[PDB]
Structure 1
Amino acid sequence: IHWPCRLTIGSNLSIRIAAYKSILQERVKKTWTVVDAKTLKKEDIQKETVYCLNDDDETEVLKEDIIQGFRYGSDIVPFSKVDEEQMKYKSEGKCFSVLGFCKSSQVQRRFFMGNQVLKVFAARDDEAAAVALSSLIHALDDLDMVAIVRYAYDKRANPQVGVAFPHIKHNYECLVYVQLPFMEDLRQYMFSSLKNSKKYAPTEAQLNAVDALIDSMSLAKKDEKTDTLEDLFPTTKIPNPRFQRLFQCLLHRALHPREPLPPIQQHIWNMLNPPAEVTTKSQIPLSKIKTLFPLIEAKKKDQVTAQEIF
């Protein structure tokens, strides 16, 4: 979708732009709706509640005789969102306020929040914007820069920070975007040192056999002398198996519901297996590892009780 705006640096720089939500997980398109079981319509679908009062004597109380209190230490402070709307945080929205520029060596994938990518490009009637954009992405690539941009989508939206970088190539100079965290978006547990664990150090024979596994491992192979790494199982071309499973199962009900819906089908699993040569060549390293490393297990698993009488 096209989303226009104007990025700002200071109080003097303003460039009309256009943003596009690009990397977005597709979810259920027909969210399942509820009907009656003996008529199969919304003739019996309604609601009955007014959120009766929690008391020693539960009194049927109106939805307007009641306060949205708030957990405050060891109590529930009375409050209504009418109070928020008059002294809540007031976000501006539709803004790309660039706060600063840091070293590209300072930002890490560990410091990425969000789920998606936003492509942003200059708006039309602005060719100077386009030439300046290409030149500035050249400059940023030269100088190893990453921008801090406090961004707010609209009056509805809060400050949503993030950074977008140009995928400089012969193909599109798109802006791969990632949301950035705050300190409330991070925690830091304690993790003891492990390479120093005398009780749990890997023996050199086990290490060499693990290297044998890794060599027998091959998913992103390298056979092209043109410096091309070839992967034989990409993830960007396999959509949610929810969709395929739902379609395959639905087929029966759409045609004849009485008998059970089709299983997930061996072909679906065939799209989820790597080259068997890799597993075969790893088996000898796999066997030597499973002989060189001792394991113990405890079982707390579940069993199906819808069970065939034969």
Structure 2
Amino acid sequence: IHWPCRLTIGSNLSIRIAAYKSILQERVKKTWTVVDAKTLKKEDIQKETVYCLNDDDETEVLKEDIIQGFRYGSDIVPFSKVDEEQMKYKSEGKCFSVLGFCKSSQVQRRFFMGNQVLKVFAARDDEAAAVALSSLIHALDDLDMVAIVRYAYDKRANPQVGVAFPHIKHNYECLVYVQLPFMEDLRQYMFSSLKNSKKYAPTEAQLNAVDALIDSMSLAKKDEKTDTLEDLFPTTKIPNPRFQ
């Protein structure tokens, strides 16, 4: 299916766009059902959830006598569900706004986040939107830039900051959007340097052997008929063995 929205650079410009999920991890939809060992029937199995206090007597409490709360460090503060819904961050749903434009070098793959990649095309059967999107894509490609944008599927979806970059092919052209990490999602881990290390300095013979191994195990062949790199082991086209 297509996700329709409006790419807005400011408060006036707006381009009708449709986003599809280009890449998304595939999972089995059928779920294993627990049944009784003897009768092989689901009816003879029941799962019940009960709540009790931290006491030997094991006092029983109704499900309607439980309040949500949160730990604040050495203590727990109640936080009712209605209170949380009232005080939770609220924003307009289905927003695709271009926060800004940045050099493609400033955005690195290693910082990519999320579990999906979106492909954004112009609105179907819309000449003006297609022309505007093509102009934007060509300008970004020529300037070697990407668009840092704000994305939200709907009202409930949490706002996300992502990067959209051009993707131009002779068959079609579009934008590729991938989520970017927040300042809270980055881990600052320090690792000891390996280039300046003296205890783990390889010798010349070891480097030569590693070079020979790398050359021998190359998975790409340089076809001289067109002077192009052909992949002998393309793992992207292989199906997932788990399903089979």
Tell me the CA shift for residue 89 of structure 1: 0.5
Q: Given that residues 93 and 158 in structure 1 are in contact (C-alpha distance below 8 angstroms), is that contact kept between their aligned partners in structure 2?
A: no
Q: Given that residues 166 and 176 in structure 1 are in contact (C-alpha distance below 8 angstroms), is that contact kept between their aligned partners in structure 2?
A: yes
Deviations 1:176-211 (A, max 9, x none): 221111111211211111122222111111111211
Deviations 1:129-179 (A, max 9, x none): 111211221111111211111111101211022122232121221332211
Relative to structure 1, the CA distance from residue 15 to residue 174 in structure 2 (aligned partners, 3 Å threshold; closer, same or farther) is closer
Q: Given that residues 35 and 42 in structure 1 are in contact (C-alpha distance below 8 angstroms), is that contact kept between their aligned partners in structure 2?
A: yes
Pair member with larger Rg = 1
Q: Given that residues 149 and 164 in structure 2 are in contact (C-alpha distance below 8 angstroms), is that contact kept between their aligned partners in structure 1?
A: no
> Whose helix proportion is higher, 1 or 2?
1
Tell me the CA shift for residue 125 of structure 1: 5.2
Q: Given that residues 52 and 62 in structure 1 are in contact (C-alpha distance below 8 angstroms), is that contact kept between their aligned partners in structure 2?
A: no
Q: Given that residues 145 and 165 in structure 2 are in contact (C-alpha distance below 8 angstroms), is that contact kept between their aligned partners in structure 1?
A: no
Distance 1:21 1:228 in 2: 30
Tell me the CA shift for residue 212 of structure 1: 1.4
Distance 1:70 1:77 in 2: 6
Q: Given that residues 33 and 42 in structure 2 are in contact (C-alpha distance below 8 angstroms), is that contact kept between their aligned partners in structure 1?
A: no
Number of equivalences:
243
Distance 2:54 2:12 in 1: 56
Distance 1:121 1:48 in 2: 48
Relative to structure 1, the CA distance from residue 50 to residue 145 in structure 2 (aligned partners, 3 Å threshold; closer, same or farther) is same
Q: Secondary structure at the match of 1:99?
A: strand
Relative to structure 1, the CA distance from residue 203 to residue 153 in structure 2 (aligned partners, 3 Å threshold; closer, same or farther) is same
> Whose strand proportion is higher, 1 or 2?
2
1:97 is aligned to 97
Distance 1:77 1:225 in 2: 71
Q: Given that residues 140 and 166 in structure 2 are in contact (C-alpha distance below 8 angstroms), is that contact kept between their aligned partners in structure 1?
A: no
Q: Given that residues 153 and 160 in structure 1 are in contact (C-alpha distance below 8 angstroms), is that contact kept between their aligned partners in structure 2?
A: no
Structure 2: segments with no counterpart, 5+ residues: none
Q: Given that residues 112 and 178 in structure 1 are in contact (C-alpha distance below 8 angstroms), is that contact kept between their aligned partners in structure 2?
A: yes
* Stretches (4+) displaced over 6 A: none
The Cα RMSD (Å) is: 1.6
Tell me the CA shift for residue 9 of structure 1: 2.2
Relative to structure 1, the CA distance from residue 176 to residue 9 in structure 2 (aligned partners, 3 Å threshold; closer, same or farther) is closer
Distance 1:92 1:55 in 2: 46
Distance 1:45 1:13 in 2: 58
Tell me the CA shift for residue 113 of structure 1: 0.6
Relative to structure 1, the CA distance from residue 181 to residue 204 in structure 2 (aligned partners, 3 Å threshold; closer, same or farther) is same
TM-score w.r.t. the length of structure 1 is 0.74
Relative to structure 1, the CA distance from residue 38 to residue 171 in structure 2 (aligned partners, 3 Å threshold; closer, same or farther) is same
Deviations 1:3-48 (A, max 9, x none): 1111222222222221111211111121111111111111212232
Distance 2:165 2:239 in 1: 26
Query: Higher relative contact order by CA 8 Å / sep ≥ 6: 1 or 2?
Result: 2
Percent identity among equivalent residues? 100
1:265 is aligned to none
Tell me the CA shift for residue 225 of structure 1: 4.2
